[PDB]
Design a protein around this ligand. Structure first.
Ligand SMILES: NC(=O)c1ccc[n+]([C@@H]2O[C@H](COP(=O)([O-])OP(=O)(O)OC[C@H]3O[C@@H](n4cnc5c(N)ncnc54)[C@H](OP(=O)(O)O)[C@@H]3O)[C@@H](O)[C@H]2O)c1
Ligand SMILES: NC(=O)c1ccc[n+]([C@@H]2O[C@H](COP(=O)([O-])OP(=O)(O)OC[C@H]3O[C@@H](n4cnc5c(N)ncnc54)[C@H](OP(=O)(O)O)[C@@H]3O)[C@@H](O)[C@H]2O)c1
Ligand SMILES: NC(=O)c1ccc[n+]([C@@H]2O[C@H](COP(=O)([O-])OP(=O)(O)OC[C@H]3O[C@@H](n4cnc5c(N)ncnc54)[C@H](OP(=O)(O)O)[C@@H]3O)[C@@H](O)[C@H]2O)c1
Lengths: 468, 468, 468, 468
């Protein structure tokens, strides 16, 4: 029941000023477990406070209100503060006064520096992944001000260019409208998105740009074009003045590291100039396969993905590079080569030779569904596997790469806009002797984009740290 | 233009939020800027929403923030105050004091009834129209608390009905998620939607329900079944104890008033028990035609409505009322009959015998387009007609019904969720001689449902009163 | 290869046509080449159809044309003669005379009953399955004249029913036009379909029809309503005078035999009054699984069926039996429950407890794909499994149920109209160790309907007899 | 009724040998009004004989059988002989013997030459129009042997090229399977389609091909690429050795003639080296507008086309040259610039300045619908306009460019594969004072393709002549 709804609103209204003071004065983003309370409607704060059951026992707004009331005068510097962890492991201390507990558990923060130098991001390409990257980058510059989108690079076409590019960022048939205002300065070739000025750079050669011409230096280029997937090709960006590092939103060929965030971002070194974020399916299934292989062992795995179509395919039957992709995407079920076996082996080198996979592309514009047919080296029960994945999903350090649900009503549309790389549908799970079958949802556009943003911030050094 | 000043703009908005929130709680006042609310919206919409005030007068946030701090002290009643109207006719006036002006432009309210009695709404049916009526009734209850959704009536199917119907309100392939929480209480057969308890009532006969059992009386029933379109049928509802009035979401047959809100809602009298809201197409074009007819003249007019499919139709060819309407809705363009021309002429009898039209149904799930080919009694040029409709849509008494837009690249999905009954695509207007072509978009589901909600509020006597 | 000889090939075929046509008229003989008819087909199909005889033995047209001229003189009866079987085991024999061979391979027929008594078929319902049953019954009446469609039964809607239902049989968004003419006789409530008069009978109660009124007796009813899936319900039909047997186009509940033709149709006895044809998915995969299970062994098996939507579902989210099944069928990928695994195990009880599966519904209107993940009791290689299924599909007793194909670029629309219950995509087969992945296409509407037509012909005693 | 069906079949079976003798011996294609009886099932011959009511009073097969029985020994040379016109205006002579009448009315033909030298056709491009052109060309080489498809030109890609190109001709998601067999000779880069060997030529420069290298000379290049629409560009083909003439399947810019067959093909001269077939909509509406403007006079016309999407558009929102075309075609109604006003003025120079037009692109893969809003210079009645268009459609020399129907059941799917440029839906027609509104269907892929084939045969000199 919700007979208490209006009080819940009323406490959250008390919370907003406090939340926003810590933001503007102390650069402190307040969260409740995974979920932000910053730049957010009162009703969202309610919804997110309900959510805390799904990790803890029972979370009332007052405990948040009281930690916030005692955080306003604690002279804090920048940091992400989880209001919920502070509630739980205060109650499990256990002794008031609250203040005392906070000053202790938020020690490194108190009095720390409230500014960090941001890092310039350039999007090379501005397509489906490119633009969702730009949305996220603009949201997070407003939360954290760590990575600044400064520019996009597109080829010169036909001089209404700029208006269409801004419109493609303002609007999306699938992802709906941009959270903010998008204005265009035609004279200086800039798209303004909220606070952020995005220079549009016209070029046919990734190697002959002087980014310093636009006040860009030391930039991470996120190439979302996919025209170059080998080191020799991606190396073109490093010839452009202003470029420190390159992230490919696609499987990199040869020696290029393929990085699945949460799983092998610790193998990114200071010296790695060129890195790749793998594919959407790779990011969807690799957390899961790694976690299952370490616990139970995977003799063999097949992946079938029932996948949304992408923009390389054709509205109507016509020629195409790949397998059967050139048949009309919106009228057909299409059997397609996935590279996901090979990709999963790159990042988990221990499953080399043990995996096969295949795609079926169907008439939807976003969101996909991996089916993992897994032969284990141990006998397993269904509820034990569900509970161990729910645990990883909700409390492990792959918390943000993996979600777990037991919703009997959700379908592909409901996953549009999810921030996880992979969402295990728990009701579906099958286990029988050594056989496991897992079903994984992913928003292949946005879910993947979020992984790429995380790679970009590790590389830039501006991942926020969460206390405690 | 630019957004060099965006972080400045956020700052102010945020000093507004606690003050907008006082008024709403303490004084039951909703605050707007030329018809855009600032209650239960982000800081970003407050920025957007003061920005679009250049369309109207030709507005700094401080003018609002200066206004607001006068209204926390003023012993105010229940009102929809506009900050925009209040600033314009302060400048273009003899000016200071501020306090003095806001206590004379706002005499009617200062110390008044802060609470009207709400009126109980029953939703008979709970499909595509009914569930959006629910979403609006719920969020307008938070804003104004005039009309309260009390109950839906459906037929008993299984024993898992209640939870399936809660799901249907919580998620939607087109309209996305409910803004709030939906909880189900099985013991009492209640869907909670934010603070709103919605009784589920199960009945095969609209005539044999004592609504007073469930605490409901003098209710308006919004029959969104489509089952009964004549007086006899809809009179069934009046036989049920607790029912005062009936609103049909559809063209009423025979002698039933068909109401297009903004145009002829004043034809509703206190003894009118049963009212009709006409079709989506009628609501979308009647305003535009009347405005065009009053200003230039209409000699002749053709309507082609290019229209989304509706749920009565068929995924794959099968039986239906009409031969063409039952063929695979998602695989065909379907030329079909429209009642619009005859229905437009009911409401505008001055156009009786001057109008024709057809409908073509296409594989989209929501949003339609009316193409209006008008021979006029007068010569027009494209830029002049545009500016006329732009003025009509900003200043006229049909603001809420008519919007006009200049935006490029816009397509049908961008109009999901729009509040206006019809939106004139400025870029598409064609005008040569006495010949005019207008393109009018409409969210046949949500746009139309907002018009239904205005009739309901009108019948019930709770149209918010907007001052001054 | 080439077609340097194509105009030569047409020439011969055309000297066949008048002779194939004699046999059919005079002697009630249908002529085929390894299971492909040459009656009421183009000259081009006769070329195609002698060409695909290299798949089987490893065939000149003259061998056929030489055969034919012997059969115009031979006082022949009613038979489905194969020209292919007759040529192969003439060469690989002691050969001339030709006349002598064809009067000893074809002793059973030479001078026999040229006319069997047909059996009256009633179609109860007339939707997606029923109308394709009609198309098959009509064109098989021209070929064999064993089962005759006599009547459909529908509920009275309007007074333009008859013509709407004639239209539904004449046109189809997926299956294209009826091959023939459909005429309506309103006075007698008859749809003419080529030479076939189909009575339309209107009834709310399957139990209260004297079919003998309309000249129908000892009929098989093919209940394609879906309404009644148990013995009690389907027994209603037997209470109607004129009814002998009932065939349900669906999995029958309880104790009703579920029949997969090619596999267990011999379980039908003369005292079986009510029979079930199982689901599309069951018909598509049961044959393949049994063949794979007999040859290698099945230790474990998972089925994912990627499946077209069906007409019970919803264009746009609304109520349904299942929560997920009622969401917008054309906008979503929908993970849902399948009965297939349990139904496969009914028919193959040797696989009881070794099978699992799920279904995903996608926005296509017809044609589905079963993905079979099989752990086998034996090691297999891709090329060997392929050649096995290829042999099974050409030579085995499940030829009509199983096809195998090597063709590139094939996608779901190319399988509309296919006669086989399931078609193995050769290119997609994956095999490594004991692990096998098979992809089986099926026209869930037309393929399945052909299996229904085989049960019907079997129950009725009119399976064409194919010699020698 | 069809109680006489089997006799109808039986007479047509007598007809087939005769039809085919005249074909193979005399190169004589027999037709009944518009419809061929050659390479066609018996049931088609029936259907086409029914059709003759729709032009005449009552047509029985026997009159066809008897004209054919007396045509077999009349020593005829090549010609198209309409069996129906010969039936009508024999009965309206009137005197037997039949023979005498034929030898007189088929005078020019008797004893004439039975061979004509064919013309080599090259398809530059092999996309949606290209391949339908290839289907038609292969059908008509088998009927008339006037234009021979010899080659396609595609750019060099990635070496599975040839198999995909053959597969794209074999199969089509919308147009279904090819009528014949398609084999590939990989060694000589040939696609065999039935009798016809198609050389695949790989080139990046239309100007540097020696077509004589492949035994091609004096060829009409049908450029269906649309990369070059100006004379300077199309002139590139004339530099290639082997090229006589060029036909652009698109509006040609500048001085290039835009040819709508039936309407201005008489303006093609012996000296015109480069000609264009206009657009699909232009071909759909120009017959109609010309015919209406000559009778009644067109003050002003607007065209709205509700148009299928084409392959230049995007599955999902992305950048694009044109207006709003880059939004996702399968999810949206999209307002688009048509050039059809300008195009219709080119071919009808008399409507210059009097026409506007617009497209709405909707989620269908083929078939479109023009709505013509016409202000006339005369008052008109509805039935008189319907009857005058039905007359033009069925008996004028634009018979094949225009059809007329009064079918209450047909929708866009039913027009796939129509051979007319434009099909007027007569039930829809509106007329009121000086205002006419006409609705025109067209299969924008195939309908247009057929017009282009006709242009190709006029230019080649191999249009067949029909007697009488
Ligand atoms: N664009 C639009 O959709 C649009 C716009 C304007 C007006 N309209 C009109 O609004 C009406 C509702 O349309 P809709 O699209 O919302 O239809 P819908 O989605 O089919 O919803 C209709 C609702 O009414 C219920 N219902 C139907 N027949 C009933 C009966 N005999 N007894 C009780 N309940 C019954 C349904 O029951 P279940 O939930 O059990 O199926 C469902 O809840 C129609 O008259 C339509 O013409 C529609
Ligand atoms: N892929 C497939 O479609 C497929 C394959 C295998 C088996 N099945 C099964 O075959 C059955 C038929 O499915 P379908 O897709 O053909 O359904 P459909 O297209 O809805 O056709 C069902 C037909 O039965 C009629 N009907 C329904 N309820 C009735 C009732 N109470 N009394 C009398 N007639 C009634 C309908 O009447 P109206 O014409 O008046 O609407 C319609 O003629 C279902 O059980 C389904 O599970 C379907
Ligand atoms: N409704 C219709 O589709 C329709 C109707 C009437 C007229 N038209 C016009 O007909 C033309 C063809 O349209 P379509 O729908 O057939 O387009 P399409 O399906 O894209 O076919 C284009 C063909 O031309 C080739 N091509 C494209 N650019 C080329 C280049 N620079 N050099 C060489 N070859 C090139 C393509 O090569 P690949 O195969 O390698 O991709 C393909 O074979 C267009 O101008 C269009 O406006 C279309």
């Amino acid at each position: 029941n919700h007979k208490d709804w209006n009080d819940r609103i009323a406490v959250a209204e008390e919370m907003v000023p406090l939340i926003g003071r810590l933001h503007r004065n102390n650069n402190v983003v307040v969260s409740v477990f995974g979920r932000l309370l910053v730049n957010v409607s009162d009703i969202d704060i309610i919804k997110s406070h309900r959510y805390a059951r799904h990790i803890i026992s029972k979370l009332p707004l007052e405990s948040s209100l009281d930690i916030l009331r005692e955080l306003v005068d604690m002279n804090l510097g920048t940091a992400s503060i989880d209001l919920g962890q502070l509630a739980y492991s205060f109650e499990e201390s256990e002794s008031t006064d609250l203040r005392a507990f906070l000053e202790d558990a938020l020690a490194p923060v108190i009095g720390a520096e409230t500014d960090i130098n941001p890092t310039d991001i350039v999007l090379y390409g501005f397509g489906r992944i490119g633009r969702l990257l730009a949305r996220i980058l603009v949201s997070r510059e407003a939360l954290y001000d760590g990575a600044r989108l400064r520019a996009i690079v597109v080829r010169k076409n036909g001089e209404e260019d700029l208006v269409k590019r801004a419109s493609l960022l303002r609007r999306d048939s699938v992802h709906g409208g941009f959270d903010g205002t998008i204005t265009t300065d035609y004279d200086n070739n800039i798209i303004w998105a909220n606070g952020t000025p995005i220079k549009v750079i016209y070029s046919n050669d990734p190697a002959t740009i002087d980014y310093t011409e636009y006040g860009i230096n030391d930039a991470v280029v996120v190439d979302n074009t996919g025209r170059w997937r080998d080191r020799e090709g991606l190396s073109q960006h490093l010839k452009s003045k202003g470029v420190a590092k390159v992230v490919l939103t696609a499987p990199g060929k040869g020696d290029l590291k393929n990085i699945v965030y949460g799983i092998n971002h610790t193998d990114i070194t200071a010296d790695d100039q060129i890195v790749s974020a793998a594919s959407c399916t790779t990011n969807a299934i690799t957390p899961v396969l790694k976690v299952i292989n370490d616990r139970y062992g995977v003799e063999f795995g097949h992946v079938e993905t029932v996948h949304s179509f992408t923009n390389d395919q054709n509205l109507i039957d016509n020629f195409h590079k790949g397998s059967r992709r050139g048949r009309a995407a919106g009228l057909n079920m299409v059997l397609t080569e996935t590279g996901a076996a090979k990709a999963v082996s790159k990042a988990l080198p221990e499953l080399e030779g043990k995996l096969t996979g295949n795609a079926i592309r169907v008439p939807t514009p976003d969101v996909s569904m991996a089916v993992l047919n897994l032969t284990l080296n141990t006998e397993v029960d269904r509820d034990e596997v569900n509970e161990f994945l729910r645990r990883v999903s909700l409390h492990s350090d792959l918390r943000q790469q993996i979600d777990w649900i037991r919703s009997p009503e959700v379908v592909s549309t409901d996953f549009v806009g999810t921030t996880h790389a992979g969402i295990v549908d728990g009701l579906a799970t099958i286990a029988t002797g050594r056989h496991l079958v897992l079903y994984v949802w992913y928003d292949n556009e946005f879910g993947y984009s979020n992984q790429v943003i995380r790679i970009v911030e590790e590389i830039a050094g501006v991942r926020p740290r969460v206390y405690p």
